[PDB]
């Protein structure tokens, strides 16, 4: 079966066949499309299949399909997997895997560079000071004095689900958020909660408002440990405006390096619980959801006041006037500093030709509109005009709860 | 089986029953999600009908009712008879609301029950089509003071003597290709326009004609009419700082009157039904002016801003956007013509949802559809979770009459 998707802007139709290699479920039916819900221990049983299907993969990829080299493989994973319940990836198919699973994210639109990632093996670590160790420097790596790098470090596999390494930050840079007594917030209020159970577990909050929030790492089923991140290595920007002189005195700042660090990530049937990736900013990422969400920074109105603007009616559009200047401001704060930044209009248009390319090369790009399109001006971005088809392939990166919901304390 | 959504920025979470009732399918799959695709007899009709009309006599107190089991034992004999049958006109308005109240992909559904439905049943040749559609559009414009209005022609019979209005909307701008090579006025309705002048239209090829109507009544060849140009309310857009925004040489209609949609009543097809309501200001100044394949005013505006378009980084797209729409709403409320804002638009819709999920179990929406194309997070919709389904009565998409129609 053949599926096309059609540009209504440029009228280019694409033909997809890459989704007949689709094996999870969306969450939709055929009554119901669920495409704006957020989200909608494993046997040797079903993990052999899992195993070959990404062998299969592998080999096509590097023309070895069928080999000697293929075939041998294939039976060395099969032996350990009833030997051992599990196996272990060579190295060059951990990196093809985290590559692919990057590939396949539907919801990212910086895919166009997946090819480059750098892929850092931490498998070898037991420790949480080892784990600290290995994120330090893959942020120190990526953040190349503001010459951002794609990376990933990639912490030792799930085995019975006892023994999980995790990262229990959302992000491995994040602000603190207290909630006062009064009912206000001081810092980011999305942090509220882990910024509590930092504190909890013996850090001390210089409760203002962009404290870079320590680590809390897990390793190995053990109870977490704290760290804080040498600040030398946290590279941050203080936010001004080209024209509008009165915008630095907001105080406003961002760190540099977006890196999420509370994915699963799955390749062949295995489970990697703790692996952190980090790319670089989308400028409305920051300008428009983390300083303009009212559940986050909730800049705007105070913004709007300082370019006076009209606020009495919503119709006279001080809000979307405000937003714009301070993703301005993100933008060129940024470029200034000199630290890797993509504006949302260059970020979609090259998301298109990446797109584009893939239905080519590998016969269709899984991709999830809904957070695809930027969430302002949408419709002057290319990718608003673009049918898109979601669907989920493997390698893959994949949710999972929070670790405070599920952890077996020790004490 | 029972589905909740959650708006992320209130947490607030509502349970979804309604969703088992539907009947059509979406185009998705459990193993592919199409969300963002635009398109995804006799025996057919009793069930069909029997579904409206037990809904319909549920509405008002009265389901297992003597009056809804002899009508529903009436119908049945009439389509036993006829092979089809006559909505009552209780029915008629009440299936027209609904089809509204179930149009997943329009954000000003809030309104959906005071909606004036003008029965044109007895209509049989396009000069009462163009008398029905004079009277709708004077009715619905009524000097500024919008209302919304629907006009509903005879049912499909054989699928040979089918009523339609050929333009997509009742009032629309002319689209010319130049031999220059680009296009004068609106390029989304350059094959209309062209149909126009190939049936007998005499274009006086400017940029913001008001395209004439061309209407089919049952099954005939489709004749043009000229609405009367004090009928088209249109409203000039100036910028209320930018003085040089006039000469830009701008308007637009106040009247958004869609016509080409089919409405689905009780199993029975009414191929021309055109309803209008009121624009929401980013349907025009974000959508029909800087749209690449339509005005495309986007850079011309940039320039009289004196932007820095040497970067996209300067975002002196998204800053002439903001001050293109400011103008559009600031012109229709001067000249005191019906419009919302994004903003107003989009918190009546979380609203009516909340409506609808505490009195119906449920509320289908289409989110790509009801984000609006610009602002996106800054307004409650975005933040919300919505199930998208298909309920009938609706309107449906149906093919353009200019590819069917057997001359
Ligand atoms: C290199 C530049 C990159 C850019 C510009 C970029 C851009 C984005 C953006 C804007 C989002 C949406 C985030 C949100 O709204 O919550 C996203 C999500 C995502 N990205 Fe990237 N990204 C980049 C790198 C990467 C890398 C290196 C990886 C993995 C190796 C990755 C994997 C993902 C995944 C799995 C998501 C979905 C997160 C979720 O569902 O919460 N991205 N990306
Ligand atoms: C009264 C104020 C109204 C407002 C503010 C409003 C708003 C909107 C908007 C913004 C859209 C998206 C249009 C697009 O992007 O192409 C839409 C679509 C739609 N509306 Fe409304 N509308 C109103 C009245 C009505 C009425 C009176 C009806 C029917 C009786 C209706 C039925 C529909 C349908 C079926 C669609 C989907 C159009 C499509 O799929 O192409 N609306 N509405
Ligand atoms: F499914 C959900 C339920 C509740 C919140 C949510 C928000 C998603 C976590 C945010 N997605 C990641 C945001 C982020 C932060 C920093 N860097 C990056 N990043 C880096 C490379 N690509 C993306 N993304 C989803
Ligand atoms: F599937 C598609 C293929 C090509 C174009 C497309 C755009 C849909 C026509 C636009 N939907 C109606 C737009 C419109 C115009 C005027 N008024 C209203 N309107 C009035 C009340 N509610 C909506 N909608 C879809
Ligand atoms: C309800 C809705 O799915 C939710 O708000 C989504 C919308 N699109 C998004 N798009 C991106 N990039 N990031 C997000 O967090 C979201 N949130
Ligand atoms: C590809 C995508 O489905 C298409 O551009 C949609 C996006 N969302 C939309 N939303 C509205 N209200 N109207 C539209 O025409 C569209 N177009
Ligand atoms: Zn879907």
Redesign the interface.
């Known amino acids: 079966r053949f599926?096309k998707?059609?540009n209504?802007?440029t009228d280019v139709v694409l033909t997809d066949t890459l989704?007949l290699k689709?094996?999870?479920?969306?969450?939709?039916?055929?009554?119901?499309?669920?495409?704006?819900?957020?989200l909608p221990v494993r046997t040797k049983d079903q993990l052999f299949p899992l195993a070959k299907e990404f062998l299969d993969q592998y080999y096509s990829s590097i023309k070895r399909f069928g080999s000697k080299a293929h075939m041998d493989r294939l039976e060395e994973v099969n032996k350990e997997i009833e030997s051992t319940s599990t196996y272990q990836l060579k190295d060059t198919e951990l990196i093809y895997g985290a590559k692919h699973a990057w590939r396949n994210a539907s919801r990212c639109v910086g895919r166009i560079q997946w090819s480059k990632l750098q892929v850092f093996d931490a498998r070898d670590c037991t420790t949480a000071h080892g784990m600290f160790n290995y994120i330090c420097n893959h942020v120190k790596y990526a953040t190349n004095k503001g010459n951002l790098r794609s990376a990933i470090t990639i912490f030792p596999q799930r085995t019975d689900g006892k023994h999980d390494f995790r990262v229990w930050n959302s992000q491995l840079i994040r602000y603190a958020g207290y909630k006062q007594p009064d009912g206000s917030t001081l810092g980011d209020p999305a942090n509220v909660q882990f910024t509590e159970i930092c504190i909890q577990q013996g850090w001390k909050a210089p409760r203002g408002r962009f404290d870079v929030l320590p680590l809390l790492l897990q390793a190995n089923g053990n109870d977490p440990e704290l760290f804080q991140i040498p600040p030398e290595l946290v590279l941050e920007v203080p936010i001004r405006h080209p024209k509008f002189d009165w915008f630095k005195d907001l105080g406003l700042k961002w760190y540099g390096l977006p890196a999420v660090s509370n994915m699963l990530l799955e390749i062949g049937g295995l489970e990697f619980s703790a692996c952190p990736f980090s790319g670089w900013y989308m400028?409305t990422e920051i300008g428009?959801?983390d300083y303009?969400?009212?559940?986050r920074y909730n800049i705007?109105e105070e913004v709007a006041k300082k370019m006076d603007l009209d606020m009495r009616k919503?119709?006279?559009?001080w809000?979307?006037?405000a937003?714009?200047e301070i993703?301005?401001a993100v933008?060129?704060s940024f470029?200034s500093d000199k630290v890797t930044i993509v504006?949302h209009?260059?970020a979609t248009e090259s998301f298109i030709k990446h797109m584009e390319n893939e239905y080519r090369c590998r016969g269709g790009c899984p991709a999830?509109?809904?957070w695809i399109?930027?969430?302002?001006?949408?419709?002057?971005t290319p990718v608003?005009?673009?049918?898109?088809?979601?669907?989920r392939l493997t390698p893959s990166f994949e949710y999972q709860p929070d670790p405070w919901n599920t952890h077996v304390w020790k004490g």
């Open positions: 599926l998707v059609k209504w802007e989704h689709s094996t999870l479920e969306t969450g939709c039916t055929e009554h119901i499309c669920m495409g704006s819900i957020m400028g428009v959801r303009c969400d009212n559940s705007l919503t119709s006279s559009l809000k979307d006037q937003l714009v993703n301005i933008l060129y470029q504006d209009h260059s999830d509109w809904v399109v930027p969430p302002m001006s949408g419709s002057i608003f005009h673009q049918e898109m088809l979601n669907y």
